[PDB]
Amino acid sequence: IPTVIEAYDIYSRLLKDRIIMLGSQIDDNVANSIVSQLLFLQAQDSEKDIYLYINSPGGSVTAGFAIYDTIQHIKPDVQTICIGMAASMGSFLLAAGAKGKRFALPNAEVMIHQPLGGAQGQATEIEIAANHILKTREKLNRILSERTGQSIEKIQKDTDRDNFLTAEEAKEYGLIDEVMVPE
């Protein structure tokens, strides 16, 4: 990763212009970094927009909600820009950007689906894990319904299996507001 001397790595240089790059799977380490960058940018300027680029195959639901809740909590608008692919928790965070400021580039892909997990142990323990993942799915569907304007029942049906959308399809669905046309 190259250096820019004004010495910054390229990502730290973009962060100076309020750009955050989410370009990997979402785990607790990534979420801790993204959250810290959001809190830092709010402290630097509580009113100017932040730009969150998303190229992510997804990852942990709780790590994703750390980012989601921080976006909703802070005062600046967070624009979201999908490049490459926003899948699974990636597409959920894309839909979480400020309304009117959610974008995808024309050949970027969006994929939505239901949560996945594992459970092992006594019948009672499997029951607890199943109830938890089902309640998690309900919470995700309810929020995505609010962010897209689609009904919970439609979101549930449309996420039963992997569902791949073009940028234009994601706009029609309500996951983004605009397909970004070239400058």
Ligand X SMILES: *[B]([O])([O])[C]([C][C]([C])[C])[N]C(=O)[C]([C][C]([C])[C])[N]C(=O)C1=[C][C]=C(O[C])[C]=C1Cl
Contacts with ligand X by CB under 6 A lie at 58-61, 88-89, 92, 113-117, 119, 129, 132-133, 136, 140
The answer to whether 95 touches 176, Cβ cutoff 8 Å, is yes
Q: Does 1 help bind its own copies (rule: CB under 8 A)?
A: yes
Q: Which of ligand X, its own copies, none has residue 72 at its interface (CB below 5 to 8 Å by kind)?
A: its own copies
Question: Which member of 88, 132, 145, 151 is catalytic?
Answer: 88
Q: Does 21 help bind its own copies (rule: CB under 8 A)?
A: yes
Q: Does 168 help bind its own copies (rule: CB under 8 A)?
A: no
As beta bridge partners, residue 104 has 82, 179
73 in catalytic set: no
Question: Cα–chain-centroid distance for residue 142?
Answer: 15
At residue 109's C-alpha, the angle toward residues 106 and 112, to 5°, is: 140
C-alpha span between 68 and 54 (Å, rounded): 13
Q: Which stretch binds its own copies (CB under 8 A): 23-31, 145-153, 168-176?
A: 23-31
Within 92-151, which residues bind its own copies (CB under 8 A)?
Answer: 105-109, 113-137, 139, 143
CB of 64 to ligand X, least distance (A): 6
What residues contact residue 125 under an 8 Å CB cut-off, 6+ apart? 119
Q: Does 28 help bind its own copies (rule: CB under 8 A)?
A: yes
| Residue-wise burial string across 59-94, b where 16 or more C-beta atoms lie within 10 A, e elsewhere | bebebbbbbbebbeebebbbbbbbbbbbbbbbbbbb
113 in catalytic set: yes
Q: What is the size of the binding site for its own copies (CB under 8 A)?
A: 89
24/174 with CB nearer its own copies: 24
Active-site residue set: 88, 113
